[PDB]
Scaffold this active site. Structure first.
Site, PDB file in Angstrom:
ATOM      1  N   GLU A  35       0.813  -1.423   0.091  1.00 47.32           N
ATOM      2  CA  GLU A  35       0.238   0.038   0.288  1.00 47.32           C
ATOM      3  C   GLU A  35       0.570   1.317   0.005  1.00 47.32           C
ATOM      4  OE1 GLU A  35      -3.733   0.184  -0.531  1.00 47.32           O
ATOM      5  OE2 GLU A  35      -3.796  -1.436  -0.259  1.00 47.32           O
ATOM      6  N   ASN A  46      -7.668   9.245  -5.807  1.00 47.11           N
ATOM      7  CA  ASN A  46      -7.841   8.209  -6.762  1.00 47.11           C
ATOM      8  C   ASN A  46      -8.903   9.667  -7.276  1.00 47.11           C
ATOM      9  OD1 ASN A  46      -7.648   5.751  -4.567  1.00 47.11           O
ATOM     10  ND2 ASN A  46      -9.099   7.702  -2.981  1.00 47.11           N
ATOM     11  N   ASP A  48     -12.292   9.532  -8.217  1.00 48.16           N
ATOM     12  CA  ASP A  48     -13.333   9.906  -7.557  1.00 48.16           C
ATOM     13  C   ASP A  48     -13.326  11.462  -7.021  1.00 48.16           C
ATOM     14  OD1 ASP A  48     -12.573   9.353  -5.164  1.00 48.16           O
ATOM     15  OD2 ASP A  48     -14.658   7.421  -4.387  1.00 48.16           O
ATOM     16  N   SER A  50     -11.520  11.411  -3.582  1.00 55.29           N
ATOM     17  CA  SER A  50     -11.320  11.004  -2.686  1.00 55.29           C
ATOM     18  C   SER A  50      -9.466  11.323  -2.373  1.00 55.29           C
ATOM     19  CB  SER A  50     -12.213   9.573  -2.096  1.00 55.29           C
ATOM     20  OG  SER A  50     -11.269   8.362  -2.654  1.00 55.29           O
ATOM     21  N   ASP A  52      -6.063   8.481  -0.447  1.00 53.97           N
ATOM     22  CA  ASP A  52      -6.032   7.577   0.770  1.00 53.97           C
ATOM     23  C   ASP A  52      -4.529   8.310   0.660  1.00 53.97           C
ATOM     24  OD1 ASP A  52      -8.188   6.071  -0.461  1.00 53.97           O
ATOM     25  OD2 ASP A  52      -6.418   4.922  -1.676  1.00 53.97           O
ATOM     26  N   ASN A  59      -8.981   5.524   3.233  1.00 54.22           N
ATOM     27  CA  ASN A  59      -9.704   6.625   2.125  1.00 54.22           C
ATOM     28  C   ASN A  59     -10.696   7.924   2.923  1.00 54.22           C
ATOM     29  OD1 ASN A  59     -11.180   7.462  -0.305  1.00 54.22           O
ATOM     30  ND2 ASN A  59     -11.434   4.959  -0.846  1.00 54.22           N
ATOM     31  N   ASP A 101     -15.548  -4.236   9.415  1.00 53.47           N
ATOM     32  CA  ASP A 101     -16.670  -3.816   8.781  1.00 53.47           C
ATOM     33  C   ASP A 101     -17.734  -5.082   7.818  1.00 53.47           C
ATOM     34  OD1 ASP A 101     -16.025  -4.043   6.345  1.00 53.47           O
ATOM     35  OD2 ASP A 101     -15.831  -1.365   6.145  1.00 53.47           O
TER      36      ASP A 101
END
Ligand SMILES: [Cl-]
Ligand code: NA
Length: 129
Positions: A35, A46, A48, A50, A52, A59, A101
């Protein structure tokens, strides 16, 4: 801060990630390697809009607030900048919420593509833990 492999392993173990939700330490070290290359200051934008953040590339769409991702959630209740600290506490605590989650470590694309189903124990081999 750019962690050593064994240095990060020990730090993660101290913060309770070894076997957290059934995921051995090697999984977390492998995820961090691919990562961020063990760099706490890593950021990546990203498509969209957003971003990281940090050693585990958490994110801003769902997990942290960076003031520039409209309509996004802050489920870890922290500014995204706190994920870039040399102290990994905030990143670890947020990752524990993420892996809990329902989808486990599949939330991390590099884990799914480069760690999952491999011999992850190789990532902590030789380390004094
Ligand atoms: Cl799971
Ligand atoms: Na957010």
């Amino acid at each position: 801060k750019v962690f050593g492999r064994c240095e990060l392993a020990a730090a993660m173990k101290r913060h309770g990630l070894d076997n957290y939700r059934g995921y051995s330490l090697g999984n977390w070290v492998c995820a961090a390697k691919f990562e961020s290359n063990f760099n706490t200051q890593a950021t990546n934008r990203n498509t969209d809009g957003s971003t990281d953040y940090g050693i585990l590339q958490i994110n801003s769409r769902w997990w942290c607030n960076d003031g520039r991702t409209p309509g996004s959630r802050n489920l870890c209740n922290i500014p995204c900048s706190a994920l870039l600290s040399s102290d990994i506490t905030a990143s670890v605590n947020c990752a524990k919420k993420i892996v809990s989650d329902g989808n486990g470590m599949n939330a991390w694309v590099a884990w799914r593509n480069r760690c999952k189903g491999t011999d992850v124990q190789a990532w902590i081999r030789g380390c004094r833990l």
